[PDB]
Amino acid sequence: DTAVLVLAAGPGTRMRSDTPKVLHTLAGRSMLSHVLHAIAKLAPQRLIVVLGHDHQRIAPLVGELADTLGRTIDVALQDRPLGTGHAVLCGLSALPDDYAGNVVVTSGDTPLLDADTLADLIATHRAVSAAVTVLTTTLDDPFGYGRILRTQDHEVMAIVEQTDATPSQREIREVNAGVYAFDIAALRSALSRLSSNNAQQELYLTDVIAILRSDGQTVHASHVDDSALVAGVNNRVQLAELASELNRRVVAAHQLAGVTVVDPATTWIDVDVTIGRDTVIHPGTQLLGRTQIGGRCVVGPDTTLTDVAVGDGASVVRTHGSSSSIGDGAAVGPFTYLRPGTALGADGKLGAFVEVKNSTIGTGTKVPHLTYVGDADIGEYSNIGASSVFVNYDGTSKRRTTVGSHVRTGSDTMFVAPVTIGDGAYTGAGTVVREDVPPGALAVSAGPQRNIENWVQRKRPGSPAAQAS
Template structure:
């Protein structure tokens, strides 16, 4: 599929909610996953797809989120003072995109498993068909808690119904709304002002945009994916642990395909921003954290911990080492139980 040229791509990341089910004083989107905050995984994914502008909608602990993300180049913020629904959240982002004429990718800050490949496919599908809106969907065995997607002709969205507003027949549907949209921004912006709040929650749902489009005779389309784990939102610590496992599996698989050997992969924990050169062998029980790098043809002995450190090419750590915020020169041999660098 070839995407038609467009006036550009922007992204809006919705991150205003508190996340009370995390049982934490820290807002949900700042909880760490594989060495970086949850929302940073989403930011990295939309940036890799080609989003030229990224607007993050903040609300609860807005200053804390801004401070945590302030070093990210080009990130803009919009504030949702009162949480009046996802449609209202996008309304809050609209002034930041005033005059923008391209496509806008919308996703949640608590969906760190979204891949650039999937987001890129949504954008390509959107541009290929020229739809005003494209919705990422998936099918699950148990759709409890999710909005159900009602379609016509298989690919056109008639409406999305939140579970709390759904009747029995709608609740029986297993195609769910993932919360990921690609919108033709000049078409969608005027509709945001007309979103109703006549639902059980008394909120302005972004999902209602799809029903409005259908009523105008210009329905949005769906783009389905098979694996629902990729669109899993993180709501509690159990889901956080599940996402951690998925991300770390992806990291290990990627590194192994790049030429790194893990003798016991499931016992080794590598953060997302770590770089490891080819032909390096990593023994069981190793943790590599932060922005660490390990040169090629190195051997990292068992139960070693490396934190924000740089290991040169051809280095051997004998094992049970702790290397923190320092550099180990090329070709070095570090004996067992030796610690180097700052604690």
């Protein structure tokens, strides 16, 4: 029986942001969302989020996650800038006064923390019958972390905060994770005893370690060797460094599952993205949101896809796209812009300097060059000529165009919506299509060529003129 408290009440002033700190994102989720996903997997009996600074902007998102995760998540409000020890006191208020389960506490800015680490914490805590178990780790740069203070017999005595540590204490590289399990009675007693004699004048939760030690209570540290799992974020530098570590691990899981990632350092992959076996991802690529890539694809370089579905054997190169689907064996790129609602069929092709928006494009159809396709349905095995525009917009309103199958439209055709081009139709180079075109018809509008001989000697005497001569 366990209640988990997430301390998320701090203003995060060190972030220098108007967006609440625990709402900043890495790998496609907020820090608070990462932490709550980890805890929901653990499935504790109670789950309490302590909010404070900006709680009105954050509490609605907690409600949304609770629904997403199918569990209730209680919010307790902290109403004074009085420290993490006070944040826990506020969290305990959302429990019955006679609650008797363990109390696990973690901060909302420890975004890599995982269900396995929390399960091991609770198991260790129960096993040693501790009044408090604290997670620690050891770091090359421990700046801003509480330092773990140990006796000669290597027994934990205290945690001293960065701003309160002597210069020698600062050299201590073993740090507090700020993740703990508590016997609830011992915890309640130690919190009433905290005072604020420290550089912040706050009630530090970390002081409960020395308080419990002094009461002859069992105090256990558990060393997490994989430091990233308990690393915190107090500023944008730390955020980007954990985002990078998280990203290296996401990429590694895909590489172990059969995805060639040429350059993990420049390949950003959000946590929900799936990628099929033998896909190759080239450098400078970000796969974001709920993107799904099939097997044997080629993606990148310099591609960004957000919520894009790509089938098997497709290539998607130097492409910026969102909310779109690319069928099996399709070729997209290089230099292609996909806007929401784009659906390209299997074996289709969207080539260089092409943009598509809210259009359906059939099996085997190709739009290879310098073209805008907006609000259009195109059939199968058609070919749209270079430098064409689906003119959806008449200055005030937008309309659909329908192009059939096996069509071959000429370069520099304008399709002035609404118009329909029937199956197997053609248009000439340079055509402005304003009326329906029957199946098997050729539609044209360009006037005839006239050559004006010796124009250049007459109007440009000197340069093309010489050489004409």
